[PDB]
């Protein structure tokens, strides 16, 4: 028997390289077909009516907001925007399987998680406009959301940096004896970053109650997955780190829900990481800075459509309700939009606070310098737009 400390294995007396299974990859877990029918009764979560209607209304409200804010960016009213088209099912399915206080780390294309957690329209819009209601104080670009009340850690632009952070937060939770899980969302492009290898390995070796949730939507800006990796997606990397792994149909709210629910239950009980790779397709442009027709679902495999067919089959929705909700959600979004546009931006003084908890004397000096500057040269600045 082999005695080596680094692995537990038998000897083999013939030379055989291990080949990857890429053509026959890890199968894709599905619960409902594209016509919203349950495929296998034993997999049906039987979520109650009110909950399924909340999944549905959260996706469509996000979609309504996406359309309006994308238009607002085109018109130059906000500086930037990124839509969530095609991926709404991954957000709501997974968020619904979490406990309300489970801590979420994200990437930027997970706003449905906040919407499911009842984040006000007013605050989504406050961040995008950088207005006085923004608790982020207008400091980050649009869609960089965060909510301490709803346990959603502020998004930052550098890709995959939240992965090892999420793991540290999960270790701390273990120690605290939390019965809390951390979930960490990221795209398949971000998974190429060195921070992903760090987070996956730390989570396994330090035994952390974390769910890694990878949204595999086929592209990282212009780059197709054929140029991103050569193994069988992200799900096939999990086992190499000792992480329990699964791949799901990301357009199937119930498949996402079931996988996330079981991962949460087991990650918290066993202090072990789980990896979920949700297969989807990025229907929108990458962002408002991107015209995606430069380098490359909507009608035949959309999470919202599939969920709508399911509601109809239970008798839980109809055309009349769909019309009334389309109207109500438009009105709700337009009300927040109009309010967001009429609010002033924050005091320019806020440019200097929170750099450190306290303000260093030399930083206060710079703040004073700006105040003096604006007293003399204020006509040359957009002052009438900013509070105070």
């Amino acid at each position: 028997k082999p005695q080596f400390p680094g692995a537990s294995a038998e000897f083999i007396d013939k030379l055989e390289f291990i080949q990857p299974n890429v053509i026959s990859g890890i199968p894709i877990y599905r619960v409902m077909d594209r016509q919203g029918q349950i495929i296998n009764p034993s997999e049906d979560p039987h979520l109650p009516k009110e909950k399924v209607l909340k999944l549905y209304k959260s996706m469509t409200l996000l979609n309504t907001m996406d359309r309006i804010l994308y238009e607002s960016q085109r018109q130059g009213r906000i500086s930037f925007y990124m839509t969530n088209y095609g991926e709404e099912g991954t957000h709501v399915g997974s968020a619904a399987a979490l406990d309300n206080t489970d801590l979420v780390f994200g990437q930027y294309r997970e706003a449905g998680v906040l919407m499911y957690r009842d984040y006000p329209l007013e605050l989504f819009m406050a961040q995008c406009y950088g207005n006085i209601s923004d608790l982020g104080k207008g400091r980050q670009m649009p869609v960089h959301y965060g909510c301490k009340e709803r346990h959603f850690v502020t998004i930052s632009s550098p890709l995959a940096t939240q992965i090892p952070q999420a793991v540290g937060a999960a270790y701390a939770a273990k120690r605290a004896n939390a019965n809390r899980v951390v979930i960490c969302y990221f795209g398949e492009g971000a998974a190429s970053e060195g921070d992903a290898h760090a987070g996956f390995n730390f989570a396994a070796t330090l035994e952390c109650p974390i769910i890694f949730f990878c949204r595999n939507n086929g592209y990282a800006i212009s780059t197709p997955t054929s140029e991103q990796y050569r193994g069988d997606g992200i799900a096939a990397r999990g086992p190499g780190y000792g992480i329990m792994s699964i791949r799901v149909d990301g357009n199937d709210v119930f498949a996402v829900y079931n996988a996330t629910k079981e991962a949460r239950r087991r990650a918290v009980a066993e202090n072990q990481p789980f990896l979920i790779e949700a297969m989807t397709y990025r229907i929108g442009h990458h962002s408002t800075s991107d015209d995606s027709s430069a380098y490359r679902w909507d009608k035949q495999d959309h999470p919202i459509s599939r969920l709508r067919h399911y509601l109809l089959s239970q008798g839980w929705w109809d055309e009349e309700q769909e019309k009334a909700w389309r109207k109500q959600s438009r009105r709700k979004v337009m009300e927040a939009f109009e309010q967001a546009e009429r609010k002033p931006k924050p005091n320019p003084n806020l440019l200097f606070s929170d750099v450190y908890q306290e303000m260093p004397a030399q930083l206060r000096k710079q703040q004073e310098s700006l105040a003096r500057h604006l007293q003399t040269y204020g006509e040359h600045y957009p002052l009438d737009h900013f509070d105070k």
């Binding site: 980050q140 930052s156 550098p158 921070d195 780059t223 140029e227 500057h373 040359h380």
Partner: protein
């Protein structure tokens, strides 16, 4: 806009992104070893800097990498170790940090530590840089002072399309690893005549773009246009003659040109979008004070970004614009 943009055979009107493409095209045409790679470069890049190059030169020479900056730079170093020209792209300068170890511990030290048995001199890293009106914390940064403390690399920042193509070609051909920062606000805004055929502008050489006798103003990138305007404001409002200098190369920098100017004028104002503390203006100011002590009539002024992260909604208040520069100059003239 906080700024206004104002021999070598046939020329064409080119904006800054087009001049970059022209430099790259000229490089690949004349150097069969040269390759260009990074995130999204194959379809022409997120700022169009590589449009048409893959079609012209082939998918083995202009290609996308996986999304991993430390991989991008380590990969380019290894190409350059074989002697092949490696032109790496980092999508925004803000995202150069994951590669900081490969740049500082590896690329910068490669020739020294091997006694010149190996080198990565044929590596160039290009990256969009500087503010853009709404880039906020991670699409706005100017990281040149981080790199200035690293012996063994060169750091170069152009102010215009003509300067960009001649400086980029010099970086590509220079026998040391170079970081070329492209001021992204200028990609479409700045446009002027640029020679179609290749030409070089020397590295480690500042350019006096306007002679003056009362004060020396030094900047680089977009900020050169800000100080050019400041010189005009100072002439009109104060009857003050400003010598305006574009530093161009951050390291090794042109100490002689700057000191020669300050010996003549007796006053120096340096401006950059990067934060004040630890910013590269501190290196210039210390050195000038050491070399021009007897000539300096007033303290050297640095007009820089505040010591904060780069904000979204507050950008108009954050940047060292023409009024901040002018006011500082006014005070220094009054000294």
């Amino acid at each position: 806009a906080h700024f206004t943009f104002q021999e070598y055979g046939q020329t064409q009107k080119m904006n800054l992104f087009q001049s970059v493409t022209s430099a790259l095209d000229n490089s690949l045409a004349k150097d069969p070893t040269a390759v260009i790679f990074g995130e999204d470069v194959a379809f022409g890049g997120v700022f169009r800097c590589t449009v048409g190059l893959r079609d012209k030169y082939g998918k083995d020479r202009v290609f996308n990498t996986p999304l991993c900056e430390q991989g991008i730079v380590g990969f380019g170093i290894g190409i350059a170790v074989t002697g092949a020209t490696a032109i790496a792209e980092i999508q925004f300068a803000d995202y150069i940090f994951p590669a900081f170890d490969q740049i500082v511990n590896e690329a910068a030290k490669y020739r020294y530590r091997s006694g010149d048995l190996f080198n990565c001199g044929s590596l160039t890293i290009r990256s969009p840089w500087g503010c853009v009106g709404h880039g906020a914390l991670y699409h706005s940064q100017s990281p040149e002072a981080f790199f200035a403390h690293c012996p063994g690399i060169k750091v170069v920042i152009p102010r215009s399309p003509f300067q960009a193509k001649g400086l980029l070609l010099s970086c590509i051909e220079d026998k040391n690893p170079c970081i070329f920062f492209e001021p992204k606000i200028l990609y479409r805004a700045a446009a002027e005549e640029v020679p179609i055929e290749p030409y070089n502008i020397p590295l480690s050489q500042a350019e006096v773009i306007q002679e003056g006798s009362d004060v020396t103003l030094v900047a680089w990138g977009t900020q050169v246009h800000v100080i050019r305007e400041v010189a005009s404001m100072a002439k009109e409002k104060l009857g003050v003659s400003c010598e305006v200098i574009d530093l161009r190369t951050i390291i090794p920098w042109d100490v002689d040109t700057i000191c020669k100017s300050v010996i003549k004028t007796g006053r120096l104002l340096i401006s950059h979008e990067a934060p004040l503390t630890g910013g590269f203006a501190s290196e210039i100011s210390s050195t000038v004070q050491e070399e021009c002590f007897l000539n300096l009539e007033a303290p050297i002024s640095r007009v820089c970004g505040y010591d904060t992260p780069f904000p979204h909604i507050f950008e108009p208040f954050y940047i060292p614009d023409k009024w901040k520069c002018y006011d500082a100059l006014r005070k220094m003239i009054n000294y």
